[model samples]
Every structure is written in structure tokens, then in C-alpha cells.
Target: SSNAEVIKELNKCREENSMRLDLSKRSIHILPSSIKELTQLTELYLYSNKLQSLPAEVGCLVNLMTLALSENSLTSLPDSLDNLKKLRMLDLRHNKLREIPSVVYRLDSLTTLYLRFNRITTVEKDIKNLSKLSMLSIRENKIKQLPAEIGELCNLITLDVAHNQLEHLPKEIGNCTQITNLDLQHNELLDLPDTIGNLSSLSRLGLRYNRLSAIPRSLAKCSALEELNLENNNISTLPESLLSSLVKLNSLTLARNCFQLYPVGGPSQFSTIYSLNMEHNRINKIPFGIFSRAKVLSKLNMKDNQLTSLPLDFGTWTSMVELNLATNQLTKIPEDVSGLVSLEVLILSNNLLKKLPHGLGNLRKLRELDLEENKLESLPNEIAYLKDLQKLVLTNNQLTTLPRGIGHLTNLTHLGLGENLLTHLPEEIGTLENLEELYLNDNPNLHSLPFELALCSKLSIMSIENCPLSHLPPQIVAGGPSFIIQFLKMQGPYRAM
Candidate 1:
């Protein structure tokens, strides 16, 4: 039947028979009030509608096991909603709900409730009475606090209240020990109570973008935690015993915090920590003992810090594969950094570096090196020793030219030399047959592109914007990647070919 015809038929059958109605994504604007006659209805799907309200007769569907009314314009629910004693799942996401109906507290059989992306300001009393609920999400709301009765839901395995206005959580939440995933990101939380330590079953905890001053000690008890994100917070100091307790932690992001000092402990304390991101902090120096204890740490990001130098014992990071120290105050790198034989990626952008340590050549396994925005006049001949290097970034530096040995990086794919004072590039650059992306923009001193550069069959994206070039290179433009053409088009006639 047609949409309107179907609604009429549904209304006629609702008076004396059980039925399930699914009118989702049909551009529905309102639910027929005749739906109240389906006293034996078990499921209803009315998602993606313009519904502003539900009829009072909706309370008649006491046997509804599932009801999905998400993506509507609903502002509130009727108090008579409590009559749905058999509701097992409820979805009210993407709605205009300003608050959860207090009568919803009576749905003891509800196991899954999704109220995300709503305008809910508060959870009412008796919320915890739904003790059988296994999943509950009320994210992206205006709730400032959780109701103390939340602890009564002992069976809840997932609770997501992230992106809310919550500044404090009730201590009673600790009693819900069965929770395995708890999302509290983008909130106003200042700190967590030690009672949270009781959640022994928790495996994922997201606390990013909060007002946290430090890593909560209570979180140390979450031994099963595998992923922890505390990014974009006020955390300046981590608890000494924090990572020691998270033996299962694999990924830990503490980026964009106020950390002025690196955690002084050794790596052995966090044996399973594989990724550690402390980027965009005030860290000035890396202590030798920090990585000494991390036996399994593979990725370490200390980018955008105030670091002036690396520790002499930096080689102790034998398991490290990637190290990012970009945008720091480092004037020099320690020779010992080459001791990390397993290192593959090294980023040293935007620093005060005048020269690379001579020992950098010892990092035979290094594949990518970023030295852009530094004070370097030229690269050391020793860089040619990195046979495995595939990417080299030297943009925004004072480099006048590259060493002749640059052609030795046969495996190189991407090379960025934009915004430099270079008047000419070595013809050897054309020897890089594997070169894919090459940037030489903003070099007004550069008057021409080497004809040999076109010999690189693999050359894809070549950008020479803001250069003083006056001639066209047909092969260079045609061989370049499509993205380069789009970029050139966006620059109009000002972009030099």
C-alpha cells in the first residue's frame, strides 16, 4: 500500500490484533494517533521523521519490546510512557528532547537505551530502577551531574555520558562495577573520586577534553583498561602509580595537556603500553629513566614541547619504532638517539636545530625524517647513509642547497623543500626514480625547475607555488597527481607551473 494507505490499514488492524510497524525513512511527519489501538504491538520503527510529539494513546503499547523514534523533532515525552512495561530497547537519539521523561524510570525491562545527540538537561529520579539495563547512552546533552541513584544499575555493561555539561559524577556510580566501557569525554569534569577504582570490569575509558588536573588515582584499579584517552585536558602531572596498574593498556593519549615535565618513571612500570602520546605539552627535557622502564613502548610522540635537548641515554628505547619531537626548542639532538636500532620514523620540525647529530647516520632502520622549519643551512653528508629513508621534510628552513649525496636516497618517495631560500636544486634530485610527492613552493629565489626532475617516472605530486619560474614544463604538469592540478586550479593564474 502507499504510505498514507499503509497508515490507514495499520490503524484498522491495531484495534484487535498484534502488529509491528516500520515506517522509517519514509519522510513521515507524524504518527497516526490510531496507533494507540495496537495494544499487542511488540515493535515500532518510526525513525527519521518530523515527529514533534507522541499521542497519549502510545501508552497503550505496553508489550513493545523495541521502539526506535530517533531523528525526529520531539521536544518531550508524555508522562504516560511508563505504561510500556515490556520495553527492552528504546532509541531517542537525534531528537530535540530537553529532558528524559521521569516516567521512563518505570521501564524496568529496558536493556538498551540510546538518547544521544539530544538536549536532555537532567535524568530524573528512579532512573536506577531499570536494574536490568545493559547499555545506556545519553551523550551530547546538557546534563551537569548524574543522579546518585545511577548506582542501582548493577547490570549495566556500557554507560556513555560523554560530550555533556557534567562537572561532577555521583560517588554512587562506583557501585555499577559491571560496566566494561565508560565514555565521559568533552565534559566539565574536574576530577574523579577514588571510588571509580571499583569498576574492575572496565576495558575502555575515554576522558578527553575535560578539566582534569591530573590522572585520577582511582583509575589505577582499572587493570583491564586497553585504551585510555585523556587528551586536551589540564593534566600537568600523572599519578606515579597510574600506568603501573593498567597492565593491559595498549594505547594512551595524553596529548594537549599542561605537562611541563616528562613522567620520571621507567618503562618497566608500563610493560604493555605500546603507544604513548604526550604531544603539545611543556616538556623541556626527556629524562633517561623514562623509556628505560617501558619494555613494549613502540610509538612515542613528544611533539610541540619546549624541549631543548634529548637525554644522553635516549638509546635505551630499543623497542621504539617512531619518535616525534617536532616544534620544540631543541638546539641539538644527542648522538645516543641512534642507539634505537628499531627506530623507523623521526620528526624534528620547527626547532632551533642548527645541525643534526653526526650519530644520526647510525639509525640504519630509519625510513622517514622530518627537519622542516629549523635553522639548518644544509644537511650533513652523513644523512646519505640512511638507505631505508623514504621521506625527508625540510620545508621552511634556511637551506641553500642539498648535499650531492641526496641522490643516494634511492628509496625516497616524498620530499618537501618549500619555503626555503634555495636558488637551485641539485640535478641529482632527478635520480630518485621512486619519488612520488615533491614540494618546492614559496622559494622565490628558485628561478627554474631542473629538466631532469621530469625524468622521475614515479613523480606524482609536484608543487612549486610562489616560485619565480616563468616557463612551462608540460611533462611535469601532466605527470603530476590529480590533486596537484586541483591545487593549482585553486590558486588561479598566480600558481606557477
Candidate 2:
């Protein structure tokens, strides 16, 4: 019975001399060599066990210090755990360990070592003999190489060897430099050692899908870097001394690189940058004197690039809030965009925007507005002054009509006029009153719908299928949206029933 419930939880940890013992998810395959009689276990959970081996009397516990042995099926380990030696956290993550077991690099007061998703291929440079190792993760292994004495662990701090097949890395890993979260993301890395700017307490550096194409200007001397993921690299160009020298860089993911421009440097090199992902590159234009002086940019993902325009001092960023220029080829947009004013989610979907600069209702903290497949024929009745607009996606535009200040948004709740060329919809859209999920489907010159949309009243999921409303009767619009809002409330206001 599951080793008799792990020998009655190891005789309750040898009658409570237990310094903690969990025997986790007890489906344990085998372990009790009488658990070496606890020996004052200093924490031994034996994680979700199916443990294929271990009991060489678990190296006589030896006052073990935290050994969880993650989801096991351990292929090997018992060289007497090098007698634990006050082991310090060794969680062999999801294991079936194929290597690294030379008695766990001789424990040596190990300090946090999680061999993540193991089927380990290599790491043994005798792991530089653990010199009190500090947080080392061997993530999704099949490791291709690393042993540059892993920079003698100089008290490494969070070094996750991400999805390995590491094509390169040992420039003595810049001798650890008290590493602060360095994850070599999905590796096959082709370059990166300018002594990785000697870590200097690095702050989050994940070389996302590496195959780097130039990036080490001594990594701008680390300068306590902050969140930098060179997304899908084959980089085009970027070491302007790592952009005006790091300066506590903040969130930078050069998405699918090979940029065609838009990484120019100015504004004290991205003035304490904030979220900038050059999505799928070929960036056509954007250096408005290097982003009109970045001005603490807040979220700017130039999605599918090759810009058409945008830099009439594009309202000086105004610490923008989520701005993804979706599939660009933009036609026009800067007509005094009220200086972004802390915009709130604005993705100009597939561009060629026919028109839209009534300064986009000056953002007014816009709340999600994605002009899907654009060519908008109209939409700037000052966008009815945003009024904290809430999710307005203009499906496939050419909007025939709709600016009765769209009933002043009133915190609209998801209104996507599907495949548009909309003919009618105003009656101040019955003052919205918090409308919900309404997608007037395929407007074949939408014939009629203005029964003040039956005063919204939280109208739910309405998809006016293939419009031809002609005043209801496609079986009351095929009995949808509550029979077209109960036949427009029995033809009573702005009648179109």
C-alpha cells in the first residue's frame, strides 16, 4: 500500500525527531531503507514520488537541508548522495536524470540547485564544485555545453539555463558577478560575451530565442540592467553602447529582429525606457529625432512593420499606455493626437486608415480601440470625446455613418461593428447605458436598426446577422438579441421595426 504509506510516513519521522519530512504524494515506488532513521532530517519532502531509486539509505540523511527530489523517476543518484553534507536545497526537477549525478557535483553545501525538467545531458564541469552555489537552474535540458567552470559560481544568483542546446556561452559567464536572473532563453545562442558586461548584479536578461546577430557592447556595462529580452534574434543593429548605456533599462524586447530602422538613439537614450518591443521588423520609419525624446515611453509595440507615417512629434509619447501599431502601412494619424495623454490600449488594426485624426478624441484614457482592417471612411466627431471609452473595435471599416458622438461611449462594453460599411446606427445609439457585446454583423448597407437599439439596457451579445434589417422580420431578425430587442420595443421610439 504505497510502501505502507511510506512506512507510516517514516514512523512519523522517527517519532518526531523530524526536522520535517513530507514523503509527498506517497505513490513512492521505493525509498524506505528505513529512511536511515530520519537522523534529524532538515526537511525532505520527496516530491510527487514515483522515485525509481534512492535508498542507499538516502546517504544517511546527514542532517539533510531541504531535498525535495522533484517529480521523480530518478534514473540514478545513490553514490551515497556524497553524504548530503548539509545540502542546501537540491530539487531535481521533473527527473529521469541522465546525468549530473556524479553525486550532485559533490554537494558542498549547495545553495539552491533545481535541475529543471531533466533528462540532463551535461553540466558537469564538476559544476565548479558548488562553492556555496547560489540558485542554479538547468531548465529543459539536453544541454549542449556550459562548463566554463560555470564561472566558478562566484555566488551566482539565479542562473537558469533555459531550454538548452546552448550553442555557446562560456566566456567564463562573466564570472557570475552576483548574477541577478540570467535566463538564456531557448538557446542555440550564437553570440553574447562581452563578458556579459560582468553582470554587476544584472536584473533580468533573457536572450529570447537566440541566434544573436551582434549585441555585446559589453552589454552597456550591465548597470543593474532591468528586463531585456532580445526576442527572436538575428538582430539588425543596436549597440549604441547598449543604447546610451543601459541607464537602468526597463522592459526591452526587440521582437523578431532585423529591423529596418527605429532603434536610433536620443532622448538620453530612451529616457529610462519603459516597454518597447519592435514587433516583427522592417521598421520603415519612426526616428522623429529619436522618438521625439522618448519621454518615458509606456508600451510601444510596432507590430508588423514598414510604417507609412507618424512623427509630427507624435504627441511626444506622453508616457503612452499600450500602443501597438498593428500591421502598418498607415495612411494618416497625427492631427494633434492630444499628446497621447497616457493612452489606454490603442491598436490601429491593419492600416491604410482612410481618416481618423480628430486627434482621436484626444485619448482621454481610451479603453481599448482597435480599428480592425482599416480604411475608415470617418470617425472623428471627436470620437465623442472617449468618455473613458471601453472596447470599441471597428471590424472591417469604411463606416458609412456613425459619429453621433456614438452616444458618448458611456463606458461601452465591447462594440465591434463587424465587416462594416454601416449605413445607420445613430439615434445616439440609445445613449449606450453600458452596452455589451454588440457586433452588428456584415452590414450590407445595414438597412434599419435605430429603434434607439431598444435603449441598450445592457443589451447582450447581439450580432444582427448579415444586415438587411428593413425593419425587423427576418423572423424578427432570426430571433436574436432577444428578437431584435423585442422587435425594437414594439416599434415605439425612433421606430424602425
Candidate 3:
């Protein structure tokens, strides 16, 4: 019914028969006393309004199941609300309420409660009385403490207490065995109660951006594990018990930890671990064959460390496909690099490596390779072995020449070679028919362009500025790569060899 027709019908009708009504975002400043007559109402939506107060007569709606008063100016709930014996859900989000009123504590039938983005600072024992609560979210508040009685919520399924000032959780929280996902990130927690392991049904947990120094062995007991992120902490060592217990864990991240090039101790043997990030840990060295036996360990990230070199037989990551080792002191790539033939993505930028092993060309599965900001002087001809490479980045290096083998990368789409010392490019470069972007700027010695490049039909982007190239027209060079290719083709092999 149109709002005007409904309003006319409700004026003469008995409020007891109404089942549901929505008055959301109506700029309503006050609730009408007739609201109390809707005894049969099951859901009432009064959200996004300028409501100042709710009438005490609202308690007469005994059958009301849901009440949403979010995005309002309400400072408190009416004390007469105790009569809503069947209320199952209540939303008080985006309001000016300084604290939860005593009347709300007695909402025995409530199953979901959301008080986020409010001024509430404390959770009293009354919260525990919500025996049927399945979800409780009280995020982004100044709450300093959660009562030890929090465990009384044995039926609680999801609890979100993140973005608060809580430093410690009551051991009683361990008794909340029904909880599956727990998010305690962005808190002041220095340690987690070992009792957390009592949550046998837990699956996902996040404790990042905390001050934790040590992990309790009890966490390993969680049965249905999937992911854990505990980055940006002071934890330097992971307990062997924790590493051995999480047999089902698939992903673990401990970036920016105080650990110094941590050894392949506990977590190195995980069979289900597919992704592990240990970057920025100041690890200077890794021993030989540390993670070689890790069957499913496919992803490894260890950038911004003090690594000088990798052992020839580093690890048995047989199934590994991604490896990141940027911003280190690496001076050379070991010949054993060919052992990881399954690698698809490899990042080794911002290092001191002067040369790469010819064996690097054996990774046929390689698709993306980043070698920016390094001291490499040349590329091995074996680099042509990677026929599936789609992106090959080589910026800010001192290379005077590139292996003609690069023309074999028929799948390459992006080739970055900015700020280098190259004197010329191979005529075979025209073989890259799939090439899309070719970066060749700031190379002082590059004096000419090859006519065969006009055959690279997909090469629409080419950068060759600041080079005293006497082999091509300035307008063609300034017009970009596509024009340069046409200009060189028109000039007809005038390199004067």
C-alpha cells in the first residue's frame, strides 16, 4: 500500500493486528504512542532517523522479534522495554548511546546483539546472561575489560571484539567451545591465555598488530585450523609445540617479527602449509635443504632480510611455485636454482646480485620474474629456456647487452629495461610477437633501432628516451614504440654495419 493509504488505514485500525511496519530513514523525530498498540508486530524497523526517544508504551508489543534503531541520535533505551519478552534481535549501531541501559540487559530472548560504533566502554556480567546469543559484535570502542563470566556464553558461535583496548582475555573465555572464528586483532594483548586451545571447534584466528612475544602451546590443539596471521609483533620464536600441533593449517603469516632469519625448525615440516610469509626478519642466511621435504609448501616470502646467499640445496619445496627474496645482499644465484623447476613467480629485486646462474632458464613454468634495482651486469643465454615467461622486469641495472635468447620468450607481455647501460638490442627481438610493453629508457649507449621489431604486431608501447640514437628520426622516437617500429622499417636497415 502507498504510505498515505497505509497511514489512513492504521489510524482507524486496532494496533494489535499489525504484523510488521517499516519507518526507516523517515526523519522521524519522535515515536507515536500508537506504536504500543501493535501487539502482534514481529519486526519493527526504525533505522536512519533523527529519533530522540522511544515511548515507554512500546513495551506493549510483546510479540516483537526484531527492532532496529541504528543511525539515530538515541542516547538510551526506554526502561519499559522489559515487556518485549519475544525480542530476538536488536541493533543499536551508529548512535549516540553512551552505555547500554539496564533494561537491555534483561532481554532474555535476544539471539544477536550489535552495539558497534557507540560510546560503550564496559561489558558487564549481564552480557553473559545472553544464553542463546550466536553472534556478538562490539567493535571499535574503548572497552578496557571483558568480564571473566564471558565464558557463560557456551552457545556463542561468532565473537568479534577487535579494535579495542583490551590487553588480556579472561581465562574463562576458553569455555566458549562453540566459537568457530575469533578475531582479536588490533588490541593490546601481550599474551593469549593457553585456555584458548579449549575452543576445539575453532577454524580461523587473527592476532596481528598486537604486542605478543610468545605463543601459548595450547593454540596447536585447535582442530579445524585454516589460517593464522600474527604479524607486526615481538614474537621472535615459534614454539615447537605450536608448529607440530597445527597439522591442518594451510596458511601462516608472521611478517615483521623480531626473529632474525629464523631457522627451518618446527614449521618447516608442515605437510599442509602452502603459503608462509617470513619477510623483514633480518635473516642473514638459510642452511641447506631446510624445507626440501615440505611437499605442499608452494609459496615462500622472505624479503627485506640480511640474506647474502642461498644454499645450493636450499629446500625440497618440490611443489613450490612462488619465491620472494627482494631487498637483500644476494650477490649470486646458485647453479642449483634449477632444482625448483615448478616455480612460476619469482621476485629478487633490490639486491646486490651481479650475475644469475645459467640454470635459472630451466624453470619452464616460470611466468613472472622481477629483477629491479640490482647490480646484475648481464643475463645468461639460458634465460631463453623459460618460454612461458609473461613478464620480465629488469630496471636500474648495469647490463651492456642482453642474451639474444630473450627473443624466445614468445609469451612475454611486459619487458622493463629502464636505466641501464645497453649499447644495442638483438635483431631477434622482433620475434616477440606477443610483446606489449618494452621499456628501454635512459640507456646512454643504445644508438639504433632494429627494423624486424615492426613485426611485433602487439608491441604498442615502447620507451627509448634520452639515448643519442642516430639510427632513427626524433619524431618517430618521441612518437613512442609503435611509431619507432614503423619509422625503422621505412628507414630500411640503415644501421651502416
Candidate 4:
């Protein structure tokens, strides 16, 4: 609050010979010059302040090892600021720096430089001068070009230059053999250099939302790649050897690509691949027994494809946890599907199916089953065996009546039966005490509901907006669930001793 208070705090730092000082977010517009007196200080944090510049007196702290000045308006560094020869790390994110200071290039002992979210437009060729830098991040900047000398950073372990205007990468980038995770997404790049395979130790690579048409076959040389995302790209074909080469691959996504012929040979070729997504393609069918040896595969998504039927060896997916086959032309379910006893989620929406196989009940662990927009006329009684089922969606189907076995789903929470031909719900339907919501609108032929409907005490909302049952009073039909529940209780159908 006064000059004496500021002087007293500074005096304490000088007397205690403290190695750490934190003066962050004090609305400070200027750095106190007295801070220079603490020559033994090793760490200084002044983040999230109004500071626009650092004083030349900061050079007096020759023992400083770490300096954090992020989230400020700093536009330049004082020439005298380079005297601190022992600085090992510098964080200057969220600033207005237009270019890298030449003084920074002279900091030979610096190991890290975090300069994301700045106005920097170019990274000069002299960047190779930082021989000891292990990590460098210039993410989300205005840089239009990257110097080819970047490949000279032989010790770089992690580099992130994503969200930039660069059109391509220097072939020398492959020389950064110590790279582990490289992020190059959200850029204007059209292709990668063929020399990319030189980084034998690279593991994770992301090229999402780019114009690349094909991945280099040399990518297979990256024996340890675990996660690769090529979503929303133009890549149409990839060599099978590349898939087999990723022995440690865990997840691979190729969604929104222009692939017509199936690319992945078989899950057996990728022994470690756990999740694969190839949605929005033109694949018409898959071969049988493709996943027979893929014991670790868990998630497979192939929605919005031209698939007409699943292969007979579908049971090979017994280890599956989630399977999405929506927006296909399948007309029937294979009996082998019963072998997927561990399946927890199954989506078969927007297809040409007329009936689900009776074996559907064998998937005892199913928690969600979506079969909307299909040609089904009735649900099989076997559906009652799914004791763990919680959500069942059967909207826009031809279901004339629900099986009485439907009442056994005590764990069901959401029931969607809209736009169906149902005449009436079985009395047993009211036994679903756990049901919370029901959608029964647009059922034109529905005439009456059982008096037992009042038994579903947990229902939160019910929709019967377009059911044309002439026997129901117009005023009562216009009323909401509470009113409908009262009338159901008054009906004579539930009178008992």
C-alpha cells in the first residue's frame, strides 16, 4: 500500500538469500528494479500481470535457472537481459512477441522454450544454434515458413509447430531421432517429406484436417507408433505393410477419407490395434474371420458406409465392447452375433433390416441397443433376457405390438417407440419400474393403454402427441403426464381385491 511496504518485502528477499520468488498477478505494470539485488535467486514467477517489459537490471541475477513471465503484454526483451548465463528454461506464452529475440539464441545453456500463442511470423535458420534444447513449442502462431536448418536440432525430443501457415515440412525433420510426440495438425501442409521415416523413435503423429492424399510407405519404418489420427483427410490407400509395421498401435482413425476399396487387410495383421474407425467411406462388405485373432480389439466404428451385410464370422468379435454399423444396408443379422456375449453397445440404425435375429437375447451384457429407422414389425421375446440393458431405441419401425416379455426389462431407463404401428402396449409394459422416459407419438392405430400403465411410478415424461385413439377425450389427451396418470388410475382395468 505504500513505498515502505514494497521496500520491506524486497529487503527480506535480499537478507534471506531465497532461491524462489513469486509475485504473480499483482496488476504490476513494471518489474521492481530492486529484484536484481537477489543474485542467488534461482526461480522467478511473474505470470498473469500487466507487465509490458522487463528491466535491464534483471541481468544481475546470474544464478537464475528458471523464469516464468507468461500471460503478459511483453513485446521485447532488453539487450542487457541476456547477461543471465545460467537460465535453463523460459516461458513467455500469451504475449505480443513479434519475433524471437537474438539474445535468446545466445542462451546456450537453455533447454526449454515455451512461446505458444504469440504473434511470431518466422523461425529463422539460426534455430539450429540451440544444440542442447530438448523441447520447443511455437504452437498457435502466425509463422508462414519454417527454416530448413530446423533439422539440425539433433537433441529435440518433442516439437509442436501445429496451427500454423506452413505449407510443408523440411525433409531434415526426420533427423530429430529423439522425437517422441510430434504435433503438426491445423496447418496448410499438403504433404510430408519422404524422409520422415528417419525418426525411428517417433511414436505419436497427428495429421488431422489436412489435404494429404497418401501416407508415405516409409511411415512403416516407425516401428513404435502407437496412436495415429488421419481424420478428415484425402488419403485413399495405405500399404498393408504399414499397418502391420505398427506393432504397438493402439488406436487408428481414418474417418471421412475417400476410400472405396477396403484398406485394412485384417485385424490379425495389427495384433495390438485396439480401436479402428473408418466411417463415411464406400466399403460395401467385410471379409469373414477378419477379426478372429484380434483378441485386443475393443471398438469398431463403420457408420455411413455402403455395407450390406456383416460377414458370417462376425462372432470373432467376441471381445468387442462397442460396435457401430449405422447407416448401412443390412437386411438381416447373422446368427454368429450371439457369440458377442461381451458386447455392451450395439448400434444398427438407418439400415434395411426387417427382423433382428432371435439370438439377440444372447448379448446379456448389452447396456444400449439402438435400432431406429428400420423395417422391424415386432420385437422378439428373447429381448427380455438382457438384464443389464438400460436404453432401447426402436423409433420409426413397424412394430404392431410389443412383446409381453418387454416387461422383464427392469433396468430400462429410455424407451423410444415413436412412429410405429402399435395398437396397444401389453399390460406387462407397466412393470418397468425403472423407466424414466417414453416416446410413443405418431402411432396412428393405437387405441387403448392398459390400466396397469399407472404402475410405472418412475416415469418422468410421456409423449402421446399424435396417437389418434378416438375413445380418448380430447381435453385429457391435451393434458400432460400427471393428468394422464390420474385418468389411468381411475380406469376400471386395475381394480383388484
lDDT value, residue 369 of candidate 2: 89
Give TM-scores for every candidate, taking all chains together and pairing residue i with residue i. 0.88, 0.38, 0.92, 0.94
Tens-digit lDDT string for candidate 2 (1-497): 45886687678768877689887886778765777877788888878878888878888888888888898888778888888799899898988787878888888898999989887888877788897889999999899988899999999889998999998898998988898899999998999878988887888888989898878888888878877789998989887757778778877888998989866566577777788889999989887656556677789899999999987778877778999999999998887578887899989899999888877887899899898999888887888899998899999888888888889889988889899888888888889889888898988988888877888888778887788887667777767778778777777564553
TM-score top scorer:
4
lDDT of 4: 0.85
The segments of candidate 4 whose C-alpha lies over 4 angstroms from its true place after superposition are 1-8, 264-267, 492-497
List the global CA lDDT of all models.
0.83, 0.84, 0.83, 0.85
**Model 3 C-alpha lDDT per residue in residues 388-463, reported as the tens digit of each score:** 9999999999988888998999999999999999888888888998999999999999988677776777887788
Clashing pairs in 2: none
Question: Ten-residue segment with the worst summed lDDT in candidate 3?
Answer: 1-10
Model 1, which residues run further than 4 Å from truth?
1-3, 8-19, 36-40, 442-451, 463-497
User: By the TM-score metric, which is better: model 2 or model 4?
Assistant: 4
TM-score of candidate 1 versus the correct structure, residues matched by position:
0.88
lDDT of 4 by residue, 191-222 (tens): 88898888899998978877788888888898
Ranking by lDDT: 4, 2, 1, 3
How far residue 57's Cα lies from its native spot in candidate 4, in Å, is 1.7
